[PDB]
């Protein structure tokens, strides 16, 4: 058989993103699950690269968010991609909990 | 043909995607900077630096 | 008489019909017109109007 099916790791990739049979009639509301997967990586990657400059004491909390926005190269990008991207997390997710509430995706067997 | 040179081998398809994104990187950056400064002539620092002529 | 499998759907079949056969059918139809009418069958009656007054060659529109 093919190597995408014969491997122990790639068959998890194969059975989920390559060969997974999706119904051929799903509209664009079925992309909000794939956006939340992308929007989670945006928060996590712009959390690690932002928490390398963040001190968490009560004296240096607000003074080291401004150290990100003024002193780090492209620091205004990271703080704004991640404070607004967190507010885009909850807007995609509110449209993801309302697709499933509309199209009956809560019912059995799900 | 054109297909037989560029799009046939994938080794030279992505060779001229990267060689077309290397030229696009330096050209589109210059052609945006040269527009964005020209849209704001009279307001940037090197216009104030020349207008301090004493 | 004239068979059904030669004048069945003479709308999509008049063009891309070979030209020797294309005027063979108008030769058989011109002998069925030397009869009292309303004895021609309807695939033979609506397919002589398409030959004389259809939309092909002449009477083709200026734009497709």
């Amino acid at each position: 058989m093919a190597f995408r099916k014969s491997n122990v790791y790639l068959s998890l990739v194969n059975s989920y993103i390559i060969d997974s049979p999706q119904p051929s009639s799903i509209n664009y509301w079925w992309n909000m699950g794939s956006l939340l997967g992308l929007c989670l990586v945006i928060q996590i990657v712009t959390g690690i690269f932002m928490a390398m400059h963040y001190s968490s004491n009560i004296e240096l909390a607000f003074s080291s968010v401004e150290h990100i926005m003024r002193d780090v190269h492209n620091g205004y990008i990271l703080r704004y991609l991640h404070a607004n991207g967190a507010s885009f997390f909850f807007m995609v997710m509110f449209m993801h909990m309302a697709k499933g509430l509309y199209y009956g995706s809560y019912r059995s067997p799900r | 043909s054109l297909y037989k040179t560029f799009f046939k081998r994938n080794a030279v398809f992505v060779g001229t995607i990267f060689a077309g994104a290397f030229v696009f990187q330096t050209v589109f950056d210059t052609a945006i900077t040269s527009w964005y400064e020209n849209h704001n002539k009279g307001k940037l620092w090197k216009d104030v630096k020349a207008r301090i002529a004493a | 008489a004239l068979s059904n499998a030669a004048v069945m759907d003479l709308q999509s079949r008049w063009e891309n019909m070979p030209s020797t056969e294309q005027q063979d059918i108008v030769s058989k139809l011109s002998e069925r017109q030397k009869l009292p009418w309303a004895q021609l069958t309807e695939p033979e009656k609506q397919a002589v109007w398409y030959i004389s007054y259809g939309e092909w060659g002449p009477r083709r529109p200026v734009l497709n």
């Binding site: - | 030279v12 060779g15 994104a21 290397f22 030229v23 | -």
Partner: protein, 51 residues
């Protein structure tokens, strides 16, 4: 009547040695895209006649 082999054939290696050199060029062209703006690599990257 025997070929050299180690589950890859020498006759099937010289059929890719054109396209293995074209893939080395398509990676060096991919290295130059991602590693410009590196000021150390711009000693041999604005030696080009424009840009």
């Amino acid at each position: 009547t025997g070929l050299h082999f180690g589950r890859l054939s020498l006759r099937s290696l010289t059929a890719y040695a054109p396209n293995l050199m074209l893939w080395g060029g398509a990676s060096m062209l991919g290295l130059f895209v991602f590693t410009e703006g590196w000021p150390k690599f711009q000693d041999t990257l604005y030696k080009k006649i424009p840009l």
